[PDB]
Structure formats: C-alpha cells, structure tokens
Design an enzyme around this catalytic site. Structure first.
Site, PDB file in Angstrom:
ATOM      1  CG  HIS A 268      -0.648   0.046   2.507  1.00  0.00           C
ATOM      2  ND1 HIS A 268      -0.204   1.226   3.074  1.00  0.00           N
ATOM      3  CD2 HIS A 268      -0.702  -0.858   3.513  1.00  0.00           C
ATOM      4  CE1 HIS A 268       0.053   1.026   4.348  1.00  0.00           C
ATOM      5  NE2 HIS A 268      -0.242  -0.242   4.644  1.00  0.00           N
TER       6      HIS A 268
ATOM      7  N   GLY B  14       2.315   5.914  10.124  1.00  0.00           N
ATOM      8  CA  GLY B  14       3.738   5.705   9.805  1.00  0.00           C
ATOM      9  C   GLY B  14       4.269   4.369  10.316  1.00  0.00           C
TER      10      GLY B  14
ATOM     11  CB  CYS C  57       2.189   0.409   7.635  1.00  0.00           C
ATOM     12  SG  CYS C  57       0.463   0.629   8.158  1.00  0.00           S
TER      13      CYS C  57
HETATM   14  C1  LIG Z   1       0.287   2.165   8.574  1.00  0.00           C
HETATM   15  C2  LIG Z   1       0.522   2.825   7.214  1.00  0.00           C
HETATM   16  C3  LIG Z   1       1.519   3.939   7.232  1.00  0.00           C
HETATM   17  O1  LIG Z   1       2.515   3.938   7.901  1.00  0.00           O
HETATM   18  O2  LIG Z   1       1.175   4.932   6.411  1.00  0.00           O
HETATM   19  C4  LIG Z   1       2.173   5.401   5.458  1.00  0.00           C
HETATM   20  C5  LIG Z   1       2.272   6.882   5.532  1.00  0.00           C
HETATM   21  C6  LIG Z   1      -1.112   2.445   9.140  1.00  0.00           C
HETATM   22  C7  LIG Z   1      -1.393   1.760  10.476  1.00  0.00           C
HETATM   23  C8  LIG Z   1      -2.551   2.405  11.236  1.00  0.00           C
HETATM   24  C9  LIG Z   1      -2.618   3.927  11.308  1.00  0.00           C
HETATM   25  C10 LIG Z   1      -3.269   4.211  12.652  1.00  0.00           C
HETATM   26  N1  LIG Z   1      -2.897   3.038  13.432  1.00  0.00           N
HETATM   27  C11 LIG Z   1      -2.527   2.001  12.693  1.00  0.00           C
HETATM   28  O3  LIG Z   1      -2.191   0.892  13.116  1.00  0.00           O
HETATM   29  N2  LIG Z   1      -2.143   2.085   8.166  1.00  0.00           N
HETATM   30  C12 LIG Z   1      -2.858   3.011   7.521  1.00  0.00           C
HETATM   31  O4  LIG Z   1      -2.520   4.192   7.431  1.00  0.00           O
HETATM   32  C13 LIG Z   1      -4.198   2.556   6.998  1.00  0.00           C
HETATM   33  C14 LIG Z   1      -5.212   2.984   8.045  1.00  0.00           C
HETATM   34  C15 LIG Z   1      -6.067   1.828   8.451  1.00  0.00           C
HETATM   35  O5  LIG Z   1      -5.585   0.735   8.649  1.00  0.00           O
HETATM   36  C16 LIG Z   1      -7.562   2.112   8.592  1.00  0.00           C
HETATM   37  N3  LIG Z   1      -8.379   0.941   8.307  1.00  0.00           N
HETATM   38  C17 LIG Z   1      -9.357   1.011   7.397  1.00  0.00           C
HETATM   39  O6  LIG Z   1      -9.292   1.794   6.443  1.00  0.00           O
HETATM   40  C18 LIG Z   1     -10.554   0.177   7.624  1.00  0.00           C
HETATM   41  C19 LIG Z   1     -11.877   0.628   7.724  1.00  0.00           C
HETATM   42  C20 LIG Z   1     -12.627  -0.472   7.920  1.00  0.00           C
HETATM   43  C21 LIG Z   1     -14.074  -0.725   8.100  1.00  0.00           C
HETATM   44  O7  LIG Z   1     -11.817  -1.551   7.941  1.00  0.00           O
HETATM   45  N4  LIG Z   1     -10.492  -1.128   7.748  1.00  0.00           N
HETATM   46  C22 LIG Z   1      -7.882   2.739   9.966  1.00  0.00           C
HETATM   47  C23 LIG Z   1      -7.212   4.097  10.148  1.00  0.00           C
HETATM   48  C24 LIG Z   1      -9.387   2.852  10.178  1.00  0.00           C
HETATM   49  C25 LIG Z   1      -4.526   3.127   5.619  1.00  0.00           C
HETATM   50  C26 LIG Z   1      -4.795   2.005   4.665  1.00  0.00           C
HETATM   51  C27 LIG Z   1      -3.749   1.231   4.196  1.00  0.00           C
HETATM   52  C28 LIG Z   1      -3.975   0.166   3.343  1.00  0.00           C
HETATM   53  C29 LIG Z   1      -5.262  -0.120   3.005  1.00  0.00           C
HETATM   54  F1  LIG Z   1      -5.483  -1.157   2.155  1.00  0.00           F
HETATM   55  C30 LIG Z   1      -6.332   0.595   3.463  1.00  0.00           C
HETATM   56  C31 LIG Z   1      -6.088   1.657   4.318  1.00  0.00           C
END
Ligand SMILES: *[C@@H](CC(=O)OCC)[C@H](C[C@@H]1CCNC1=O)NC(=O)[C@@H](CC(=O)[C@@H](NC(=O)c1cc(C)on1)C(C)C)Cc1ccc(F)cc1
Ligand SMILES: *[C@@H](CC(=O)OCC)[C@H](C[C@@H]1CCNC1=O)NC(=O)[C@@H](CC(=O)[C@@H](NC(=O)c1cc(C)on1)C(C)C)Cc1ccc(F)cc1
Lengths: 304, 304
Positions: free
Chosen positions: B41, B143, B145
C-alpha cells in the site's frame, strides 16, 4: 491507536553486555569505553554475603581473579576500582560498540527499560518504574545481576539502574551506575525493610488520559475538585500526593483532550471511592501507575 | 523471581529496519540480504485506499519511483515485485547486518515481539499474541506500517508479522513475510468483520503455573476435573477448548510445580464460575492469556 507497556529498542545496550566471572560467581557487566561495570558482590562467596567487608575482600583480589568474556573474546582486566557498590574493571580494549551515554539517577515514579541478561547474554526487555519506596517490580532470576535499566534520548543512552538484589517479598533493588542504591538498601544478605509502597498518582492520571485518547471514556464524570480535596482522599488510598509540578507535567495531555487535570483528579477520586464495578480501562481491571506523562506522550505522538 | 510481559532483544531486527518512500507515502521496510520487504500500500494515495487496483497502481511504478534509506545510505533499487500484500524491492547492496532468519506463519495463541517503527527508525518493543480471531492488540500510529513481529531462537530471527492495518475497533491486522494476511482481512479501507475473540485457555493455565511458581497460590482449590467437564464450562465463558496437545505442552510446568494440568483446570473452572472476587493474580485483576507455556518456561528458567 492502541496502548502498550513499551520498552526502548535494546540494540545499543546489547552491544555493551559482557559476562564477569569471579570464582563461582558469574553475572553481567556493562562495557562502556575501556571500563566494565558490575555489582561489587561478584567478589563475595555465598558465606561472605552474610556480613561482607568489601574493602578486605577486594584487597585480596587481583586483576587476574576477574574473567571478562565479550561473546567469545576475553578482555584483559588491567585495573580494579570500587565506586560505592559497583566494581569498575579497567580493560585493555575500548568497546567499539559504545554508544553516546550518560549515567543518570532517576526519581521515584520515573520509568526505564530493563535488558534482562544471564551470562552476559540478553534474554528479554521490559519497561518498569522506580516505585515510591525505591523498589522495582521486575523479572530477575539467578545470574540476572548487573542487568541494566536505561532511557534513550534520540542517540544518547541514559543508564539509570544496575540490578543487585531481590528482597524476600519478590521485588528488586539496585544502584545508579555510580554504585549508589536507590532507597535505604545495602548489598548484604540481612533483613531489609522496603517501606510502604504507594501508588504513583501522576502516572495513573497520565494513563487515564491515555484511556480517553483511545476512546475509553466511561469514567469521565461531571464534577471537579481542588489539589487539596483530592490529596485528602488520595492519602486514604495509599496514593502519593499530587503537586502543582504534577499538574504542569499533565498540561500537554490536558490540552490534547480538553480535560483539565483537576476534572481528571475528580474522575480518579470517584474510581478510588466507588471502585471500577467490573469495567476495564484500556484492557486493565485496575488503575495502572507505571506510565509517566512522557511515556503517554511518546506513544500518542510516536517519538523515534 | 517476578513475572513480566517481556519482549526479545530488538538489536538484530533494528539492523534490518529501513525507510521506504513512494511518491508522498513513507513507511517502514525490512532489509534482509539484497531484498527490501514492505506493505504494497506504499504505492496507494489515501484516495486509492478506498478500492485500490494494486496491479494497475504497481504497473505505473518503476525501480526509480522507490526511495529506500538505511539511516543515511540510499540503496539503489534494481527490481520491484509484488508477493500477495508485500512489495519485494531488489537492491544493489546485501544488508551486512542480516542475521540468520526464517519467515514463519504463527498460529493463533502464539506470542511475538513487535519493533514499532516510524520513518524506518525504531521507537519501541512490546510482546503480544495472535488472537484466536487473527487480530493483535498492538500500539501502532500513522507511519507504523512495515513494523515487524519476530521470535528469536538463539541466533535465528523468525519473522512472523508485518503491520498493515488498524480496524475501526482499534485492533490491528497484517501479514506474514510472504504477504498473506492473518485472518479474513484485505488491504482495503472497507468494512471487515474480525470474528468473536475468545480467551487462549492454554496461555491462562501457563500464567496460573507462573503465579504458583512466584508464591501466588490462593486460587489452588480442593477439586479435580476431566478434559470434558472443563471444556464444557470453558465454552460457556468464550474460552478456546483445551486439547491433549495443550496438556502435553503444560507438562514441564506441571512437573516443576507437582500440580497436574486437570487440577489447575479445576481451579480455573472455579475462577470462571465464582469470578476473582476482587483479588489479583501476579498483580492482575483479570485472567491473562498472552503468555504461552514457552514464554512461562523462558521466564522461570531464564533462556538466553
Ligand atoms: C500504517 C501505514 C503507514 O505507515 O502509512 C504510510 C504513511 C497504518 C497503520 C494504522 C494507522 C493508525 N494506526 C494504525 O495501526 N495504516 C494506515 O494508514 C491505513 C489505516 C487503516 O488501517 C484504517 N483501516 C481502514 O481503512 C478500515 C476501515 C474499515 C471498516 O476496515 N479497515 C484505519 C485508520 C481505520 C490506511 C490504509 C492502508 C492500506 C489499506 F489497504 C487501506 C487503508
Ligand atoms: C544476582 C546475582 C547472581 O545471580 O549471582 C551470580 C551467580 C541475583 C539476582 C536475584 C536472585 C534471584 N532474583 C534476583 O533478583 N542476586 C543475588 O544473587 C543476591 C540475592 C538477593 O538479592 C537476596 N537478598 C538477601 O540476601 C536478603 C535477604 C533479606 C531478608 O534481605 N536481603 C535474596 C535472594 C534473598 C545474593 C546477594 C548478593 C549480594 C548481597 F550483598 C547479598 C545477597
């Protein structure tokens, strides 16, 4: 989001851990520059530990009675010096892995990361607090002594703790890296009273802000209170008094959430009086006090 | 003595952490030999995340759209591949700090250490478990991930987890290092149901043994029971059934303490039926399930 008991990454400290052997006694040492630091009780035979005269015992030791292993490499000890309750062993080799470091003495309520070691090998890393009675609730077995506690300020490792002893109650006691004990404790196998262990009220409040930030809000009530009303209730429950310095430390969390410290004190007063009634806060069924306001800000801002 | 939620030393994994950037998006990568592993992603703009076509988005990227920083050193990317939900970036430089390593897929109820990272920098290490419903109760911010979970078997690092997602319920989901999700989750910002989260019965029992080893015995009762009596009660309380494999794995702890598994099962049955009555076990006011029998053996034997 989410909230966990988090240790600092341990890598910079792993490269400082050596094995120090003196007769039977094998424990851990900290290798910074050309000096190895360890508990001075490495020189005690289990019989000595009753009433050790550390001068008389150290006098009868030579550089060569001290075996230092850094993995498979032997370090030549070229000097032995006693600074309070720690041995300083001068070695022929500066540790090339020495990070930027300071020795600090921490205050009660402050947290640190422990690198638990056996035979100079890292086994585990956990976070804990200096209790108000200057004990720590750690996990330490035979061979664990000389395991260090540390904080990391970006690139600088601040060493605050060196493990010396368990008290019969299963809690732990040790020194700063200048060999001064935290609390009224001595490196001797005799009866030693810990003191009544109180709750770290400032830390409980910071954990409650942690809880609000992660959507756990059920304990937020209508009321308020004074530093004096709250403290009069707090002392009944063996909680440390809350001071203005504590309120000012809780400022950033207060500002982030839009909940004043004294409103949160008012909520904590309720929890002490009425109990938790079987509801958890951040997955805990009791009030947690081993998270500083810095610990909470770290983990709800992500400092690296 | 004492008992703590303990992470493995993080040093060997710190040496593998790099920052991966693709346009705007910055997150963490794992650098083993001449390959960098990260969440796919990294190629998504926050808008894409609604319904990403990873092929169509990856097709439009070249080796040179990928910035890998290892501290201050830029790595030249000479190849880019997608394996399930991870990107493999081929780099010109093998990581000289690569430890001996395996990729393993862990089972529900197993624990691992998480090295939480931001911009390829380590911030913190904490232990957690793969829940029966294949979520983890973590601490991850924006950040985080590409942060990895691992176990350490002496010199060999077994990577089991790479963080991708927080679900709206504030729990976490990710993949093994071949990019397969634990549980029925996909890397998309759409409604995904976790499943009922049950208690890891085998871990609760190990923790009770932990308690007895540390002098915490108050819940040791008169009764005994059968695998079937216990399991019939366990299902009522949303606990995972206990199997013969679980009894065998609790063998060492059983032998150490002279308390048979089914006697401890009989004690646990009471605690489920009567509740804890407000007493604590090892400083907890609830039944802890995030310690394996191996974790308890580690910490009541001191494996290094
Ligand atoms: C890690 C990604 C990162 O470092 O971003 C690069 C700049 C991050 C982890 C989460 C952020 C807050 N706490 C965490 O553990 N991931 C993201 O930024 C994703 C955010 C999510 O995982 C969202 N989930 C959903 O969108 C969701 C909603 C529903 C019904 O089910 N899941 C939450 C913030 C809600 C962004 C992302 C990444 C990859 C994807 F395929 C989708 C969304
Ligand atoms: C570390 C040293 C070690 O293992 O030696 C190398 C073989 C070790 C760690 C503790 C043992 C298990 N858990 C620990 O945290 N420490 C010791 O070996 C000391 C053990 C103690 O701290 C004892 N303290 C007392 O003797 C005592 C008794 C009373 C009433 O008050 N204090 C407890 C195990 C009882 C041994 C030691 C070392 C130096 C001393 F000055 C005294 C005792």
């Amino acid at each position: 989001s989410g909230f966990r008991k988090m240790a600092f990454p341990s890598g910079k400290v792993e490269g400082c851990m050596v094995q120090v052997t003196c007769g039977t006694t094998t424990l851990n040492g900290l290798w910074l520059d050309d000096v190895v630091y360890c508990p001075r009780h490495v020189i005690c035979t289990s019989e000595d530990m009753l009433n050790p005269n550390y001068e008389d015992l150290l006098i009868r030791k030579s550089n060569h009675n001290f075996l230092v292993q850094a993995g498979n490499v032997q370090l030549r000890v070229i000097g032995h010096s006693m600074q309070n309750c720690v041995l300083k062993l001068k070695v022929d080799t500066a540790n090339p892995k020495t990070p930027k470091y300071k020795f600090v003495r921490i205050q009660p309520g402050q947290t640190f990361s422990v690198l638990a070691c056996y035979n100079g090998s890292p086994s585990g890393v956990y976070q804990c607090a200096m209790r108000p009675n200057f004990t720590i609730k750690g996990s330490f077995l035979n061979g664990s002594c000389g395991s260090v506690g540390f904080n990391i300020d970006y690139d600088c490792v601040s060493f605050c703790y060196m493990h010396h002893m368990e008290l019969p109650t299963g809690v732990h006691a040790g020194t700063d890296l200048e060999g001064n004990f935290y609390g009224p404790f001595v490196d001797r196998q005799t009866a030693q009273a810990a003191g009544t262990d109180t709750t770290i009220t400032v830390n409980v409040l910071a954990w409650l802000y942690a809880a609000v930030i992660n959507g756990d809000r059920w304990f937020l009530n209508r009321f308020t209170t004074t530093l004096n009303d709250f403290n009069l209730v707090a002392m009944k429950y063996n909680y440390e008094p809350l001071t203005q310095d504590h309120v000012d430390i809780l400022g950033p969390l207060s500002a982030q959430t839009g909940i004043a410290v004294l409103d949160m004190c008012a909520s904590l007063k309720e929890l002490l009086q009425n109990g938790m009634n079987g509801r958890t806060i951040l997955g805990s069924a009791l009030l947690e006090d081993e998270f500083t306001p810095f610990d909470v800000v770290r983990q709800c801002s992500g400092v690296t």
